[PDB]
Structure formats: structure tokens, C-alpha cells
Amino acid sequence: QIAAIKXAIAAIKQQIAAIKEAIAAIK
Amino acid sequence: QIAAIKXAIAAIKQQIAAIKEAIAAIK
Amino acid sequence: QIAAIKXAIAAIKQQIAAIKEAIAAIK
Ligand SMILES: [Cu+2]
Ligand SMILES: [Cu+2]
Ligand SMILES: [Cu+2]
Numbered sequence: 001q002i003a004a005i006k007x008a009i010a011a012i013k014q015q016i017a018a019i020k021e022a023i024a025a026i027k
Numbered sequence: 028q029i030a031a032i033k034x035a036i037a038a039i040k041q042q043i044a045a046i047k048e049a050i051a052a053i054k
Numbered sequence: 055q056i057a058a059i060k061x062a063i064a065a066i067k068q069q070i071a072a073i074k075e076a077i078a079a080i081k
Contacts, residue, residue: 001029001033002029002055002056002059005029005032005033005036005059006055006059008036008040009036009059009062009063009066012036012039012040012043012066013062013066015043015047016043016066016069016070016073019043019046019047019050019073020069020073022050022054023050023073023076023077026053026080027076028056028060029056032056032059032060032063035063035067036063039063039066039067039070042070042074043070046070046073046074046077049077049081050077053080
């Protein structure tokens with residue numbers, strides 16, 4: 001369960017980076 | 028504590044999906 | 055490990071709030 005939480009957070013970090021890039025390009 | 032972490036991640040997944048939709052509509 | 059997961063989630067919550075503000079200003 002703890003390793004699954006760590007994996008989910010790792011995928012979320014990746015999506016956050018992509019979202020910020022997209023918003024940065026617009027701005 | 029572990030179940031609280033799982034709940035927080037579930038809410039974050041939901042917000043990520045809504046953010047990507049909004050950015051997708053703009054793009 | 056559990057406290058590290060809690061810290062990572064706290065930083066993610068902060069980034070989500072900033073992302074939603076930026077998207078809200080655009081919309
Ligand atoms: Cu990786
Ligand atoms: Cu649900
Ligand atoms: Cu703080």
C-alpha cells in the first residue's frame with residue numbers, strides 16, 4: 001500500500017510538470 | 028494515516044483531470 | 055516514509071492551488 005501511494009504520487013508529479021509547462025507556454 | 032493519504036490522493040486525481048480538461052479546451 | 059508522503063502531498067496541494075488560479079485568470 002505504501003509503495004502504491006509512492007507510485008501514484010510519482011505519476012502526479014509528472015502530470016503537474018506537464019500542466020505547468022502548458023500554462024507557461026500560454027503565459 | 029494511510030487511508031487519509033489515499034483519500035487526499037483521490038481528491039488530487041480528480042483535480043488533475045479537471046485541470047487537464049480546462050487546458051485542453053483552451054488548446 | 056509516511057511523513058515523506060505527507061510532505062509530498064502538501065507540496066502538490068500548493069501547486070494545484072497555483073495552477074487553478076492561473077487557469078481561472080485565463081477564464
Ligand atoms: Cu519514473
Ligand atoms: Cu470517489
Ligand atoms: Cu506548509
